[PDB]
Structure formats: structure tokens, C-alpha cells
Design a protein around this motif. Sequence first.
Motif, mmCIF file in Angstrom:
data_model
loop_
_atom_site.group_PDB
_atom_site.id
_atom_site.type_symbol
_atom_site.label_atom_id
_atom_site.label_comp_id
_atom_site.label_asym_id
_atom_site.label_seq_id
_atom_site.Cartn_x
_atom_site.Cartn_y
_atom_site.Cartn_z
ATOM 1 N N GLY A 174 0.773 -1.220 0.000
ATOM 2 C CA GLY A 174 0.000 0.000 0.000
ATOM 3 C C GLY A 174 0.809 1.277 0.000
ATOM 4 N N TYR A 175 2.133 1.191 -0.067
ATOM 5 C CA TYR A 175 2.991 2.366 -0.109
ATOM 6 C C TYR A 175 3.592 2.531 -1.496
ATOM 7 C CZ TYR A 175 2.707 2.613 4.980
ATOM 8 O OH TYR A 175 2.252 2.724 6.272
ATOM 9 N N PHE A 176 3.564 3.765 -1.990
ATOM 10 C CA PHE A 176 4.133 4.133 -3.281
ATOM 11 C C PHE A 176 5.517 4.723 -3.038
ATOM 12 C CE2 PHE A 176 4.384 6.694 -7.230
ATOM 13 C CZ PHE A 176 4.142 5.681 -8.131
ATOM 14 N N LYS A 177 6.550 3.966 -3.381
ATOM 15 C CA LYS A 177 7.924 4.408 -3.197
ATOM 16 C C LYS A 177 8.445 5.037 -4.480
ATOM 17 C CE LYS A 177 7.487 0.967 -1.151
ATOM 18 N NZ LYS A 177 6.289 0.338 -0.539
ATOM 19 N N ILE A 178 8.957 6.260 -4.361
ATOM 20 C CA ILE A 178 9.531 7.010 -5.471
ATOM 21 C C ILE A 178 11.005 7.235 -5.169
ATOM 22 C CG2 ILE A 178 9.460 9.129 -6.813
ATOM 23 C CD1 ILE A 178 6.583 9.370 -6.377
ATOM 24 N N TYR A 179 11.863 6.719 -6.046
ATOM 25 C CA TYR A 179 13.304 6.906 -5.980
ATOM 26 C C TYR A 179 13.731 7.771 -7.157
ATOM 27 C CZ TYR A 179 12.753 2.645 -3.165
ATOM 28 O OH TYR A 179 12.340 1.709 -2.244
ATOM 29 N N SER A 180 14.638 8.715 -6.914
ATOM 30 C CA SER A 180 15.019 9.654 -7.960
ATOM 31 C C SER A 180 16.527 9.851 -7.977
ATOM 32 C CB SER A 180 14.324 11.007 -7.782
ATOM 33 O OG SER A 180 14.635 11.882 -8.852
ATOM 34 N N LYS A 181 17.039 10.212 -9.152
ATOM 35 C CA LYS A 181 18.447 10.536 -9.326
ATOM 36 C C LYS A 181 18.601 11.458 -10.530
ATOM 37 C CE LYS A 181 21.787 9.720 -7.696
ATOM 38 N NZ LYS A 181 22.617 10.566 -6.794
ATOM 39 N N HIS A 182 19.394 12.512 -10.357
ATOM 40 C CA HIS A 182 19.673 13.487 -11.404
ATOM 41 C C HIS A 182 21.145 13.402 -11.783
ATOM 42 C CE1 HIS A 182 18.726 17.832 -12.990
ATOM 43 N NE2 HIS A 182 18.957 16.959 -13.954
ATOM 44 N N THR A 183 21.434 13.483 -13.082
ATOM 45 C CA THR A 183 22.800 13.343 -13.566
ATOM 46 C C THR A 183 23.050 14.301 -14.726
ATOM 47 O OG1 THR A 183 22.853 11.014 -12.892
ATOM 48 C CG2 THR A 183 24.498 11.733 -14.496
ATOM 49 N N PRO A 184 24.189 14.997 -14.746
ATOM 50 C CA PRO A 184 24.545 15.794 -15.927
ATOM 51 C C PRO A 184 25.269 14.966 -16.976
ATOM 52 C CG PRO A 184 25.706 16.527 -13.899
ATOM 53 C CD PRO A 184 25.170 15.153 -13.662
ATOM 54 N N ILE A 185 24.713 14.895 -18.181
ATOM 55 C CA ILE A 185 25.338 14.152 -19.267
ATOM 56 C C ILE A 185 25.580 15.067 -20.461
ATOM 57 C CG2 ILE A 185 24.365 11.954 -18.524
ATOM 58 C CD1 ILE A 185 22.305 12.291 -20.824
#
Lengths: 42, 48, 48, 123, 108, 49
Positions: A1-12
Motif C-alpha cells: 500500500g505504499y508508493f515508493k519514489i526513488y530519484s536521481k539526477h545526472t549531468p550528461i
Amino acid sequence: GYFKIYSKHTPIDLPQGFSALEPLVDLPIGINITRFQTLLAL
Amino acid sequence: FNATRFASVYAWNRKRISNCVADYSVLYNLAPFFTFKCYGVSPTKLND
Amino acid sequence: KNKCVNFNFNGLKGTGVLTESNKKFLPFQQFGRDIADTTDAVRDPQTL
Amino acid sequence: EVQLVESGGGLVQPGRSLRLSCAASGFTFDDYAMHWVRQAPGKGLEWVSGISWNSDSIDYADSVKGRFTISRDNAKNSLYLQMNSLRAEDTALYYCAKDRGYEILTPASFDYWGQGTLVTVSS
Amino acid sequence: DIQMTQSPSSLSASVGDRVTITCRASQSISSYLNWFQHKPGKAPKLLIYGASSLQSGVPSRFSGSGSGTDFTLTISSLQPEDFATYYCQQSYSTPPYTFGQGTKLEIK
Amino acid sequence: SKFGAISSVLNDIFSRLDPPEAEVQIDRLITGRLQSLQTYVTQQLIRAA
């Protein structure tokens, strides 16, 4: 019942590398999901 | 607990509790709650 | 700090010496363990 | 601390009809059942009628069946009692009590009461 | 049907006495009776809901007991504002919420 | 290794359970750890020989 959001930002295709995604947000939702669609801006 | 009406067992209602201090002595010291038996945790330890 | 004290953090009881830590926890990482699976680093709930 | 204010009382001739309103303000009203009860000037309390939290289950006293009608408006937090075909034995003091539960015929009884309104059916 | 009887009607006591009032039922109602206090000058108030459950906000001096066909209420202190008429009501039988006769209480 | 107990930490068992079944959990953990240590000592004796 939990919505897990994982994020990562990268300069390419997908670049070759290793990068662990930190746990960003947990959502106490408790619903069923079977389909999805992204959102763009024209 | 002081809700006037409850939902049916098939459509059981669920309430989420977080971001508060919970005192279980309110539930414990009332006589009417006869059936108070807990799994995996001793009731006396709930307070800590 | 800096002496053998009985500590209780969020229901986690133990005995030990609490010292300053140079470990850089992730802003979300709450507890900490080691290679031997023992809680050796912790974050105070009152002060982060 | 709850309030139960009643109006519509007065004196009418036999065979006429009058209207009573009872408004509550001290508690949540959408989930409580209410009742109207009677107290004779020289006798004890007697139940009259009752309505549930919503107008599904409705009850009237046996002696008053087919004559009196009860209504309930949740939006303005009030209930009402229309008295029709009054006789000389309906000159008592009527109380507007609130039930503890939500249904009409339950072992739960009246929790809070309000000051009764006096009516008279005579010339 | 059901019939409720009040064995005492008027009782006299002092500020430092203990009084008891009994209410009898025609048949068993399974401890489903309530005790109401009615001041002559204001709206009546409930004292006891259920057989021996004390309503919140009232002094613990009043005590209800009894099950089956007979029931009893007792006051141990008799504070000087306990002058009212006490009623016993059943909520179990087919006649809905039938009340018993009044029970006058006076202090002397 | 929890060795069949609900948790592998003694303090958790103490702070979560009353003595009547905390005793059973602690007994299970104790016998498991004792078996492991006995196995270690037996292997050490053989290697020492």
C-alpha cells in the motif's frame, strides 16, 4: 500500500555506468495500480 | 473507538495513525473492552 | 556522552558509550549497522 | 453542553393542527437519532415518537398512530413534529430528547434532554 | 407487553442518610433499564444508562444494580440538591421505551 | 540469525514481550548460539589435531 519514489539526477542511448538511486519519497496511498502514462508539455 | 456507527465486516474501514503520541492506558482501564488479547507484543509494554 | 550509559532510543535499549561520529549518513538514513550486523551508529530523534 | 431549543407551543382548539420545531447546536447531528416524549401535568414521562439519524426507520406511539408526523432537516440541524387532530388529552409538556445511538428501537436510551414546551388543546 | 412498578412513592431522609429505590418489571428484560432524574423546574437528566453503567459528568454517589426482573438505585450521600423525581425506563420489550411511574424524594 | 525467534536482538525481545514467552524466545536463541559455538570448537579441535 505504499508508493515508493526513488530519484536521481545526472549531468550528461543509456550511458554505461553505475549510480544507486536514493530513496526520495514514500506515499501512504494503499490503492491498486495496473496501468500508467507519462505527462508531457507541448 | 467512540464512533457512533461502524462499517460492515466485508467493507471493513481502515484508519491510519501517525505523527502523534499514543497512550494506551485510555483503552486499558475501561471495563467494557473485555476482549483485549494481543499477538507478538505484550499489552503492558505498549506504553513504552 | 563519553561514558558507559544505558540508552533507550525509540524503544531500542542498550548499554554503551555514545561518542561523536564522522560517518556521513544519507539525509534519509536513520539507523546504522556494521559488517557484524550490530547497531553501532544512531541518530538522535530530538537533534539530527 | 448541547442545546435543544423547542418552539411552536401554544393554545389551540380541539381538531386543529400545530407545528413544533426542535433545533440542536452542541453536537454532530447527522449521525444521531432523536425522539419526542410527553410529560402529563400530573403524571410521569411517556414516549411519543422517534426518528433515526436518517429518515429510514420511524416510530410512533400506539395511541398517536396516524395522527402525528415527525420530520428532520439535517442541513439546518433540526427536527420537527406536526400535531394533527388534537384532543383534550394532549395538553401536556413535550420534550425533545436525543438518542445515544443511531437507530430507533435499540437498548440505548436518551442521553441529553431539553426543556419542554407547553401546549394546550382547549377553548 | 410489560409493566413496571415502583414499590416506594415518597421517601424521607436527611442530608446525611442513604436511600434506596426499587423498580420491578413484569418479566425479565435482561438488565436493559435506565434511571432518569427529573427536576421539577428544569429538563430531566439521565443518571444511569444500562443496568449498572454510570453516565459521565454526574457524581459517583448514585449506584445502580440488579438484573432480570428487579432493579435498584442507591444514593449514599444525599447532597442537598438531590431533590427530584426518579424514573425507570425499559428498552428491551416490544412496547417501545415505556416509562414507569414517578418516585418523589424529599429530605427531612 | 534469528534461529526461529521473532527477532535476533535480546533487548527487542525484552522491550516487546512479557517474561512468559520472552523466556521461550530467549531459550531458542540461546540454544542456537550454543550449537554454533560448539560446532566452532569441534572444528577448532580437529584442526588443532
